[PDB]
Ligand binder design. Structure first.
Ligand SMILES: [Cl-]
Ligand SMILES: [Cl-]
Ligand SMILES: [Cl-]
Lengths: 101, 103
């Protein structure tokens, strides 16, 4: 019964062992977390979207800026700038997931 | 009005002042408001302005066809899209959303 959760910003995202961690623009909307190469490249540049309905969000125990998001078919590994911002993201994603159900 | 609400997010240039001129902002149309976001570190963002659409006036510029202004009695934002087609997409979405959010 309150306003929907919204969030956008840059997160560092694991790509692969060739390029390692790379900054990506991440947007929370439409029961999804979506990412793009950058803020300016959203028109044609969605590089992925993870539906939140059954998504599991796991803060890391050793890398205190890291959280992982997983559905059956994929896992994204993400790092925020500090642990407070990590917690803001986790809290937003969880609140959005709840509200969208 | 029965389908999902009209929502948009994207970059638009926004007028600041004559020193810094047009500056890109992340702009969001949602829940009867146009809002914009800024960051001081290119990483973490926060909403730095919101306009309620109920009585908003959207004025496409006659000569600068990339520009539209949105005003309520107390405030005005001057906004540019990258071209006039993109301007029109924004204008049309805002005007439709305004109607659909009304009573
Ligand atoms: Cl949004
Ligand atoms: Cl251990
Ligand atoms: Cl542009």
């Amino acid at each position: 019964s309150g306003p929907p959760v919204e969030r956008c910003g840059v997160l560092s995202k694991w790509t692969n062992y060739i390029h390692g961690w790379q900054d990506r623009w991440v947007v929370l909307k439409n029961n999804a977390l979506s990412y793009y190469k950058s803020e300016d490249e959203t028109e044609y540049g969605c590089r992925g979207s993870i539906c939140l309905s059954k998504a599991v969000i796991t803060p890391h125990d050793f890398d205190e800026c890291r959280f992982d998001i997983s559905v059956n078919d994929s896992v994204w590994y993400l790092r925020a700038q500090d642990p407070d911002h990590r917690q803001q993201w986790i809290d937003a994603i969880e609140q959005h997931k709840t509200e969208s159900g």
